[PDB]
Amino acid sequence: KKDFSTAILERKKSPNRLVVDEAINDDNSVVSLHPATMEKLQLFRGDTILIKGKKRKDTVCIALADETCEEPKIRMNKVVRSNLRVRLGDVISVHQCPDVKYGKRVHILPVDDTVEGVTGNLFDAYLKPYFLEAYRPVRKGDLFLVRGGMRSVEFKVIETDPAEYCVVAPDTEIFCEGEPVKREDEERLDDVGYDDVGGVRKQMAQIRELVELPLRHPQLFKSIGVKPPKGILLYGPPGSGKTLIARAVANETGAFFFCINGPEIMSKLAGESESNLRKAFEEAEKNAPSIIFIDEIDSIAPKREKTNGEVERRIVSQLLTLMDGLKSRAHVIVMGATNRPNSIDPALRRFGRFDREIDIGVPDEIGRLEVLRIHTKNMKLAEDVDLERISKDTHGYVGADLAALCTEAALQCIREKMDVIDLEDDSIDAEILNSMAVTNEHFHTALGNSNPSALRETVVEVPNVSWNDIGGLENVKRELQETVQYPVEHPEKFEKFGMSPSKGVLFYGPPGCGKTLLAKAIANECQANFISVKGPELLTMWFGESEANVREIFDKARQSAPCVLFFDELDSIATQRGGGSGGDGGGAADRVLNQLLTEMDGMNAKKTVFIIGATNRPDIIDSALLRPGRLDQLIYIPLPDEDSRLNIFKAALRKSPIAKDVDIGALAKYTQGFSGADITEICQRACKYAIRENIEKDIEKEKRRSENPEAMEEDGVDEVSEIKAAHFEESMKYARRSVSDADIRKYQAFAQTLQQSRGFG
Amino acid sequence: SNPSALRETVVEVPNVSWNDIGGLENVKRELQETVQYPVEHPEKFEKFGMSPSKGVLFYGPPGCGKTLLAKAIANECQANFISVKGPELLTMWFGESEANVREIFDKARQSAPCVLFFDELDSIATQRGGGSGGDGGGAADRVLNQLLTEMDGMNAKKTVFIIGATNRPDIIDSALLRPGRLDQLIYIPLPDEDSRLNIFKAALRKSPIAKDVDIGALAKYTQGFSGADITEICQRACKYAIRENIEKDIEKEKRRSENPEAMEEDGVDEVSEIKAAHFEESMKYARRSVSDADIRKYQAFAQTLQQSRGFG
Ligand SMILES: Nc1ncnc2c1ncn2[C@@H]1O[C@H](COP(=O)(O)OP(=O)(O)NP(=O)(O)O)[C@@H](O)[C@H]1O
Ligand SMILES: Nc1ncnc2c1ncn2[C@@H]1O[C@H](COP(=O)(O)OP(=O)(O)NP(=O)(O)O)[C@@H](O)[C@H]1O
Ligand SMILES: Nc1ncnc2c1ncn2[C@@H]1O[C@H](COP(=O)(O)OP(=O)(O)NP(=O)(O)O)[C@@H](O)[C@H]1O
Ligand SMILES: [Mg+2]
Ligand SMILES: [Mg+2]
Ligand SMILES: [Mg+2]
């Protein structure tokens, strides 16, 4: 089996599907099909055909024959590619045009920017010389290019007869009647689509199967005897993808789309907001199938505790009544968008309303890369821009932030060219304008000068850490496999033996021994999402979103199953219940303790969700967290031993320029009782010393050359500046253990007597 | 899919029976008198001109089966069971406020007969601080005083029994032990040699245990272990067996794939029963959750718990 969640997105290869390719002819009403492809299509040489494009756009052209066109090719020209909205490499479908429909009229009008420089009737110069007796097929809404000399005027197919498409026979009596098709109309063409949304595939698949399927193929649901949900609610960080995704789905499904912007509704006088809502719903019902996208729904339907006026609760109630009135099932779907899912009134998040919710969260590396590719598809990038590096460096960047980053890169490119650009002149040199290109350094500078927005939001992603990055801890990994991986990859195994596992683990040990890394590594092994939460972050949550922060992170973990919810730095929240119970500063630790235990109680029934903790202070750890049904498994992470420290050094320096004479194993003997953090700080000090050394070396070399320029560039060239043993010796000189010999036997004692904390002392 | 009404109080008869609980014969015998008789036979007490008490407190080492006894006695009497934990009560005040404890008690009244169990009294029933103060503990003080107030009005409802459970009898507020409240005191001891065999059997009553595993043998070696430790031993053993049979199946499939001509021999996946080796390995890492110094103290409290309403 496989994960069939992302199955609707898959394109089903068919004999009628041909890949896009360049044509041998620039004819706009004629393409060229390979003879074999035509035979599969039952077509013949020079036969009109309908090409199915993207965004519900299609054109009509006569297919020729040529053996150079490989089987998975169609050989269309640039104009057809633009009309279909398909770039090279897309997979269009081909259908026949048996009804050639020799048209009596083919209304043709020009575009203003393609007419600049025409001093004669366009009908007698462009249209008639190429259409009369040519029998060129024409598809309404497609821009065919024409030439009548030096100027090239492109006309849109305004109004054919038949209306859809026809063939331009000699009987087509028509001329150019005015210029009403100015180029600015392109703002509503090629606007949005599936290809314009990147970084979301699971959410996009969910939206498509909840919106497009009920509206295009309701027969499936009717036969299965299930009524599909009518309420969808997109939510996520501001600027992520919501309004784009809604419009993309609406345009791709080809259903009547009505946008109800919250500010627009609330900016009108009382009695017009409700009137507009009623009109929108009525029009959607009349023109079914339909979609009603309510952007910024939080403004028109905020939490009832926050809304003050009566003409706001009235609008909320009107919206609720209208949604309740949609149970007629007139192929109408109401989709929402709100960055504040909790700010929404609870009534909306109920059956018969917005009951199905999709979280358009922060994208991962591949998503950011795809977003950047989408946004830079039009910019004049140079041949040395590496978007992979930028995507790796852009952590916490939503799509809007990436678009702003591209814009800032372009601006920085302009600033570099400001020296050769004079602002006083009302016009800029054409050659200078066309020679501006965005380089990688511009992007790096823009990224340095740009800041992320969704850097505080919880991130649900598979960590990149593997077992290799962690040195030693073989037994800990061996037991973690049993505790986590087996009940996830093989859940039925436990049911076979009639015994359920435990969904809780606690890591206790000296600081810097690799407790945070183990959680990430085990998540990576099981390919399960990882949610990182720190005690300091939890403590500020109560002074803020309050009760709905811990509940929210746990709900997110539930929605993201399988998951590994890690609570680092339990030394603060899990502080043992004070004997003199009191205070509000610790009344937040008591909250993050009791409310957290309450959620732990309800989490054992979810399955495939494991709650892992980490504490450097097992003495103060609340004994309640150790209860069965909670973090009861206790795993001790010891200080690395002689063998483990070699692995730790190697991992810390797995990508370092270390010299050939450095004995990694030698340091292990001298560094005993040092945590992994100290072992990494040793390497950091060594790297800093090497940087100092090679900085001084390069400075001395350049100063030697400048102290008599006649001195030529000798064979001496900048070297690796590898980390010599001297640097490691100097680092070990200042290196100091972060765990004392008196603070290790105590950890051993707690390893012995930790779970006994639920009783007396 | 995720549930929605998973935080709401559930008023249902638990599925736990006396069989799931090992040992504790005397505790069950006295619980019958304390609970079942005044419910099934209410007129009996009126016949003798003496009313019973609607309060019980379970105090003992953790993992000895205090939560299970309440559910079992509810199941025996076919009475509804309402489970409330101290951590849940503490967050109620920062929320619905006064109308959470009142609401659970009203629900218990409406659901009579009922067994209102307050697990984890170690937090709400924290002894009234000598230096009374603070708002973090001002929630424990609330869930204490407001709870006692409801207990006072609950003795007239009849067929409603309030049971508590505390692993820290030292800090238990002396007010909860007053007559008209949780005044009956029942001590749940650590299981003895005979009880541990029953606990193992119950934990493994639906397990594939092999024919050579001596359940009684483990009982001798595991002394001072709570029932939770006895169940974690079985959990470790099951995990080891899962590892063993996972590796066995992987090796078998890899053997077949390392030359597909090798046919499917008579060897087929077996029960993968829990062999004695798994139990030995589990006992290797098994560690008591109750120390020998933290059992004599429970005995001392069994002796001198109800004397907490006076001085120290
Ligand atoms: N996944 C994406 N792929 C491509 N462009 C994107 C993507 N996400 C965002 N953008 C770009 O960034 C813009 C901002 O996103 P938008 O769709 O307005 O977000 P929003 O969630 O509706 N914002 P708000 O209502 O202010 O919280 C879009 O209009 C695109 O130009
Ligand atoms: N076993 C290890 N192998 C390799 N690097 C390690 C190891 N342990 C610690 N480190 C390094 O030291 C850093 C700190 O350790 P970390 O994994 O954050 O432990 P922690 O328990 O979260 N520490 P603290 O929050 O300070 O108590 C890691 O991110 C690594 O760079
Ligand atoms: N007498 C017993 N017989 C069988 N299983 C038992 C017994 N005592 C404890 N257990 C097992 O151990 C688990 C924990 O015991 P439980 O009945 O929750 O005691 P508790 O007093 O609520 N513990 P705690 O809240 O940790 O102080 C039970 O759910 C059973 O799985
Ligand atoms: Mg929006
Ligand atoms: Mg930690
Ligand atoms: Mg209890």
Side-chain angles (χ1 to χ4, degrees):
Chain A
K1 70 97 190 176
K2 82 182 196 64
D3 53 1
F4 297 93
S5 62
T6 300
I8 186 172
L9 310 180
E10 301 182 6
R11 294 179 172 85
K12 306 302 183 300
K13 287 271 182 171
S14 63
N16 302 324
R17 276 174 168 86
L18 310 183
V19 181
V20 180
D21 197 14
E22 177 63 28
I24 303 169
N25 63 323
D26 190 68
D27 197 332
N28 313 309
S29 302
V30 179
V31 288
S32 304
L33 289 176
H34 183 257
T37 297
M38 297 153 62
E39 289 177 1
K40 275 77 179 183
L41 299 163
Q42 292 67 50
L43 293 162
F44 318 110
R45 267 180 162 84
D47 290 3
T48 307
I49 55 165
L50 171 64
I51 294 168
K52 204 94 73 175
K54 301 187 302 188
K55 303 178 182 181
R56 301 292 164 192
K57 298 297 190 179
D58 49 76
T59 184
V60 181
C61 297
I62 285 168
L64 299 173
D66 68 80
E67 285 71 29
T68 64
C69 170
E70 292 89 5
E71 280 285 12
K73 302 292 164 184
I74 182 169
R75 288 203 179 279
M76 65 181 78
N77 70 324
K78 62 185 179 62
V79 169
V80 167
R81 291 193 294 279
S82 182
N83 297 330
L84 294 169
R85 317 302 175 183
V86 308
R87 285 180 166 85
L88 291 164
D90 296 336
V91 189
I92 52 161
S93 65
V94 174
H95 299 58
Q96 295 191 328
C97 278
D99 57 359
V100 294
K101 288 164 164 181
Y102 284 13
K104 59 190 292 183
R105 302 205 77 199
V106 178
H107 189 183
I108 297 164
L109 293 165
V111 184
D112 60 349
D113 66 351
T114 75
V115 175
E116 184 179 2
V118 173
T119 58
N121 185 11
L122 292 142
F123 168 57
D124 297 68
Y126 297 73
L127 310 188
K128 112 188 167 185
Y130 184 73
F131 279 109
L132 176 56
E133 302 174 359
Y135 298 93
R136 305 292 89 166
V138 290
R139 198 279 181 272
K140 182 176 174 180
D142 297 4
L143 297 144
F144 59 87
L145 183 60
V146 193
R147 303 177 183 80
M150 323 312 296
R151 175 84 291 190
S152 311
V153 180
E154 192 181 7
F155 315 79
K156 191 199 296 179
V157 182
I158 310 306
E159 179 65 12
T160 50
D161 190 351
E164 292 298 346
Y165 53 89
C166 61
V167 172
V168 178
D171 300 357
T172 52
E173 174 272 339
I174 179 63
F175 81 114
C176 284
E177 184 178 357
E179 203 287 312
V181 196
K182 53 180 173 56
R183 192 233 69 86
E184 196 64 9
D185 183 70
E186 297 294 351
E187 288 184 355
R188 299 271 53 81
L189 300 173
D190 192 67
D191 63 317
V192 197
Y194 289 146
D195 60 359
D196 298 329
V197 193
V200 297
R201 293 174 71 270
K202 298 176 64 172
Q203 304 98 351
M204 206 66 181
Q206 292 174 228
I207 296 168
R208 288 178 58 175
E209 66 191 13
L210 296 171
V211 178
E212 131 176 302
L213 261 59
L215 298 175
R216 290 176 52 80
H217 296 138
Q219 309 90 8
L220 302 164
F221 296 81
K222 175 154 287 303
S223 63
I224 293 284
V226 68
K227 307 295 164 290
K230 315 311 300 184
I232 299 88
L233 182 68
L234 312 174
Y235 66 92
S240 52
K242 302 183 280 293
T243 305
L244 186 86
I245 293 166
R247 300 184 304 200
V249 172
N251 300 339
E252 289 289 358
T253 187
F256 178 82
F257 179 69
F258 197 102
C259 182
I260 304 174
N261 213 333
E264 198 276 357
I265 299 296
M266 303 289 278
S267 74
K268 337 195 78 64
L269 300 86
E272 284 80 354
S273 312
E274 306 92 9
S275 179
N276 290 339
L277 283 164
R278 291 191 291 266
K279 289 173 182 176
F281 275 81
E282 293 169 2
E283 294 165 9
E285 293 179 14
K286 293 164 182 171
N287 314 137
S290 180
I291 309 180
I292 304 163
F293 173 61
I294 310 174
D295 208 359
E296 288 91 1
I297 183 166
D298 56 68
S299 72
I300 58 178
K303 236 167 184 176
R304 183 238 178 169
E305 303 180 354
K306 173 57 65 178
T307 192
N308 67 90
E310 298 164 355
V311 309
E312 310 181 11
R313 302 189 182 188
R314 179 169 299 107
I315 304 175
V316 188
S317 298
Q318 189 63 87
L319 181 62
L320 298 171
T321 293
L322 294 163
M323 282 201 289
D324 296 2
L326 277 180
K327 304 306 98 177
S328 58
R329 193 179 57 82
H331 319 301
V332 179
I333 301 182
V334 189
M335 188 161 49
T338 186
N339 50 36
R340 300 135 63 183
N342 296 282
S343 179
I344 289 286
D345 191 67
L348 300 169
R349 312 174 65 182
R350 289 182 188 173
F351 199 84
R353 293 169 177 167
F354 298 111
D355 58 8
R356 202 157 294 275
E357 311 187 352
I358 294 88
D359 189 2
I360 313 300
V362 185
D364 66 340
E365 173 178 350
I366 179 58
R368 297 185 297 254
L369 174 58
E370 189 64 12
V371 170
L372 288 163
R373 288 210 182 95
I374 291 166
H375 282 301
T376 65
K377 190 153 59 184
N378 303 119
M379 308 213 308
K380 289 177 58 53
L381 298 194
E383 300 285 30
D384 62 353
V385 187
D386 188 69
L387 301 171
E388 300 278 1
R389 186 73 192 284
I390 304 164
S391 90
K392 288 158 56 178
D393 294 327
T394 57
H395 175 67
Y397 283 67
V398 292
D401 298 355
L402 297 160
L405 178 148
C406 292
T407 294
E408 294 172 22
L411 260 171
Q412 184 69 25
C413 166
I414 296 171
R415 295 167 201 164
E416 298 282 348
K417 279 280 188 296
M418 202 73 67
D419 56 347
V420 306
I421 284 171
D422 187 6
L423 189 136
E424 173 177 321
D425 297 358
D426 295 331
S427 57
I428 288 173
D429 193 334
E431 194 284 335
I432 300 289
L433 168 142
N434 285 287
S435 57
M436 296 197 302
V438 182
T439 55
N440 195 331
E441 49 265 12
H442 299 159
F443 266 93
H444 190 268
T445 299
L447 176 50
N449 285 330
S450 69
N451 295 280
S453 299
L455 75 174
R456 275 99 58 177
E457 310 304 339
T458 62
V459 194
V460 192
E461 82 307 325
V462 178
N464 67 330
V465 186
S466 66
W467 298 122
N468 311 134
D469 300 4
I470 298 163
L473 303 174
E474 308 293 44
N475 62 329
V476 173
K477 298 173 182 177
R478 183 162 176 78
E479 62 187 339
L480 272 161
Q481 287 174 5
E482 301 178 345
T483 299
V484 188
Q485 178 187 340
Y486 292 0
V488 169
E489 301 289 3
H490 322 79
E492 77 295 316
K493 282 269 181 157
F494 285 91
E495 188 63 11
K496 176 182 287 182
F497 305 144
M499 193 189 309
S500 60
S502 183
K503 299 300 194 306
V505 174
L506 182 71
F507 290 137
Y508 59 104
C513 293
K515 307 195 295 290
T516 300
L517 296 180
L518 280 166
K520 307 178 76 178
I522 186 63
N524 172 268
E525 187 190 10
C526 306
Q527 294 298 314
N529 303 266
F530 182 81
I531 304 173
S532 180
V533 185
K534 303 224 188 68
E537 300 177 1
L538 294 169
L539 289 141
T540 69
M541 286 179 177
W542 193 89
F543 312 102
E545 203 173 11
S546 197
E547 293 291 348
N549 227 311
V550 183
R551 300 160 58 84
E552 297 302 329
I553 60 179
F554 273 97
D555 296 333
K556 188 176 288 298
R558 280 196 181 89
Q559 300 163 6
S560 301
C563 187
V564 171
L565 179 56
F566 188 77
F567 293 103
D568 201 7
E569 308 181 15
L570 282 179
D571 308 330
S572 59
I573 78 189
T575 52
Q576 193 172 61
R577 305 184 187 278
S581 57
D584 285 320
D590 299 331
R591 259 55 120 185
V592 181
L593 184 62
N594 281 314
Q595 188 180 350
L596 194 81
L597 299 159
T598 305
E599 293 294 342
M600 287 175 181
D601 293 357
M603 216 69 178
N604 51 26
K606 173 56 179 178
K607 313 302 185 183
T608 57
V609 171
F610 287 84
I611 308 173
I612 298 171
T615 181
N616 307 271
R617 298 296 311 287
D619 67 317
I620 64 180
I621 199 76
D622 182 17
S623 69
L625 296 164
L626 319 186
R627 194 184 87 82
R630 301 175 179 165
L631 316 186
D632 65 324
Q633 271 67 42
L634 303 183
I635 301 174
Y636 174 75
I637 313 299
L639 273 171
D641 295 327
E642 176 63 8
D643 188 3
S644 306
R645 290 181 285 260
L646 199 175
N647 301 94
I648 294 168
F649 270 104
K650 206 182 294 185
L653 303 140
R654 256 190 305 94
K655 63 190 191 72
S656 212
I658 283 181
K660 303 80 164 180
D661 65 77
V662 189
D663 187 357
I664 292 169
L667 306 111
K669 292 172 53 49
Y670 318 141
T671 176
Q672 187 157 225
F674 283 88
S675 56
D678 306 326
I679 291 171
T680 57
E681 96 192 1
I682 287 165
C683 297
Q684 233 174 222
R685 292 175 178 271
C687 176
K688 280 167 177 168
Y689 298 164
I691 290 164
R692 162 156 282 158
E693 188 196 13
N694 78 334
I695 280 280
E696 294 178 358
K697 278 157 49 172
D698 295 1
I699 291 166
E700 180 60 19
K701 184 169 64 178
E702 297 297 346
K703 171 171 164 294
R704 176 195 61 83
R705 294 203 200 87
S706 73
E707 287 173 332
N708 178 78
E710 299 179 357
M712 291 306 309
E713 296 277 338
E714 288 78 26
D715 295 0
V717 175
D718 193 330
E719 54 277 359
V720 177
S721 304
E722 62 284 328
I723 304 173
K724 276 166 273 293
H727 307 147
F728 282 110
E729 292 179 357
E730 294 179 10
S731 60
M732 296 282 283
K733 181 188 173 186
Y734 306 94
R736 38 196 288 274
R737 306 188 313 286
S738 186
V739 184
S740 59
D741 297 70
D743 298 334
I744 178 59
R745 64 200 183 195
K746 183 161 285 181
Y747 284 110
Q748 300 172 233
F750 283 114
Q752 254 61 27
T753 76
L754 176 57
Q755 89 296 43
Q756 299 168 2
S757 54
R758 290 212 303 286
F760 311 105
Chain B
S1 69
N2 295 280
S4 299
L6 75 174
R7 276 99 58 177
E8 310 304 339
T9 62
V10 194
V11 192
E12 82 306 325
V13 178
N15 67 330
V16 186
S17 66
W18 298 122
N19 311 134
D20 300 4
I21 298 163
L24 303 174
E25 308 293 44
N26 62 329
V27 173
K28 297 173 182 177
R29 183 162 176 78
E30 62 187 339
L31 272 161
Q32 287 174 5
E33 301 178 345
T34 299
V35 188
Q36 178 187 340
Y37 292 0
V39 169
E40 301 289 3
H41 322 79
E43 77 295 316
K44 282 269 181 157
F45 285 91
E46 188 63 11
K47 176 182 287 182
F48 305 144
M50 193 189 309
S51 60
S53 183
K54 299 300 194 306
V56 174
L57 182 71
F58 290 137
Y59 59 104
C64 293
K66 307 195 295 290
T67 300
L68 296 180
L69 280 166
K71 307 178 76 178
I73 186 63
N75 172 268
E76 187 190 10
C77 306
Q78 294 298 314
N80 303 266
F81 182 81
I82 304 173
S83 180
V84 185
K85 303 224 188 68
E88 300 177 1
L89 294 169
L90 289 141
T91 69
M92 286 179 177
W93 193 89
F94 312 102
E96 203 173 11
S97 197
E98 293 291 348
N100 227 311
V101 183
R102 300 160 58 84
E103 297 302 329
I104 60 179
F105 273 97
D106 296 333
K107 188 176 288 298
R109 280 196 181 89
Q110 300 163 6
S111 301
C114 187
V115 171
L116 179 56
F117 188 77
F118 293 103
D119 201 7
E120 308 181 15
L121 282 179
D122 308 330
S123 59
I124 78 189
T126 52
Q127 193 172 61
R128 305 184 187 278
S132 57
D135 285 320
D141 299 331
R142 259 55 120 185
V143 181
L144 184 62
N145 281 314
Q146 188 180 350
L147 194 81
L148 299 159
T149 305
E150 293 294 342
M151 287 175 181
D152 293 357
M154 216 69 178
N155 51 27
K157 173 56 179 178
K158 313 302 185 183
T159 57
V160 171
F161 287 84
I162 308 173
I163 298 171
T166 181
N167 307 271
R168 298 296 311 287
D170 67 317
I171 64 180
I172 199 77
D173 182 17
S174 69
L176 296 164
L177 319 186
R178 194 184 87 82
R181 301 175 179 166
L182 316 186
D183 65 324
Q184 271 67 42
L185 303 183
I186 301 174
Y187 174 75
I188 313 299
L190 273 171
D192 295 327
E193 176 63 8
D194 188 4
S195 306
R196 290 181 285 260
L197 199 175
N198 301 94
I199 294 168
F200 270 104
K201 206 182 294 185
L204 303 140
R205 256 190 305 94
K206 62 190 191 72
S207 212
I209 283 181
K211 303 80 164 180
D212 65 77
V213 189
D214 187 357
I215 292 169
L218 306 111
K220 292 171 53 49
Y221 318 141
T222 177
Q223 187 157 225
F225 283 88
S226 56
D229 306 326
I230 291 171
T231 57
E232 96 192 1
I233 287 165
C234 297
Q235 233 174 222
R236 292 175 178 271
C238 176
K239 280 167 177 168
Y240 298 164
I242 290 164
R243 162 156 282 158
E244 188 196 13
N245 78 334
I246 280 280
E247 294 178 358
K248 278 157 49 172
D249 295 1
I250 291 166
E251 180 60 19
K252 184 169 64 178
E253 297 297 346
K254 171 171 164 294
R255 176 194 61 83
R256 294 203 200 87
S257 73
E258 287 173 332
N259 178 78
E261 299 179 357
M263 291 306 309
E264 296 277 338
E265 288 78 26
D266 295 1
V268 175
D269 193 330
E270 54 277 359
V271 177
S272 304
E273 62 284 328
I274 304 173
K275 276 166 273 293
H278 307 147
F279 282 110
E280 292 179 357
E281 294 179 10
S282 60
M283 296 282 283
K284 181 189 173 186
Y285 306 94
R287 38 196 288 274
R288 306 188 313 286
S289 186
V290 184
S291 59
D292 297 70
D294 298 334
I295 178 59
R296 64 200 183 195
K297 183 161 286 181
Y298 284 110
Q299 300 172 233
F301 283 114
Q303 254 61 27
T304 76
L305 176 57
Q306 89 297 43
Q307 299 168 2
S308 54
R309 290 212 303 286
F311 311 105

